[PDB]
Amino acid sequence: STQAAIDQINGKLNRVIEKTNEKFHQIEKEFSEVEGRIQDLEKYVEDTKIDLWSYNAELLVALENQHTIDLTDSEMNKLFEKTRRQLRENAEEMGNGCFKIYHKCDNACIESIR
């Protein structure tokens, strides 16, 4: 019996190690998924943002072609540079006056977002 008793406590106690060990691995897996969504969601917010800013620059570049607006004018030059800044900070500057917008959130990533 004392032996039996010690044998039991040791059996019970190994159940606990085993249960807790596994639950921890589960918790580690969920953490990876969650942090997974977050890094996708933020890639999307980023992609979303350069889309809208790249449109803004385009619209300006559209209106100055049909001479609807003056981009050298000051008040208007501000706005124009506001859009050109975002483009530089968030896109590949090719030959002066061009940009290559690379999207960070691909189709698969856009998907997790659903």
């Binding site: 790249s54 620059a57 385009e58 300006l60 570049v61 100055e64 981009l71 050109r84 483009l87 896109a91 090719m94 006056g97 061009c98 940009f99 290559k100 917008i101």
Partner: peptide, 5 residues
């Protein structure tokens, strides 16, 4: 590719 002025 987007080209401004």
């Amino acid at each position: 590719t987007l080209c401004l002025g």
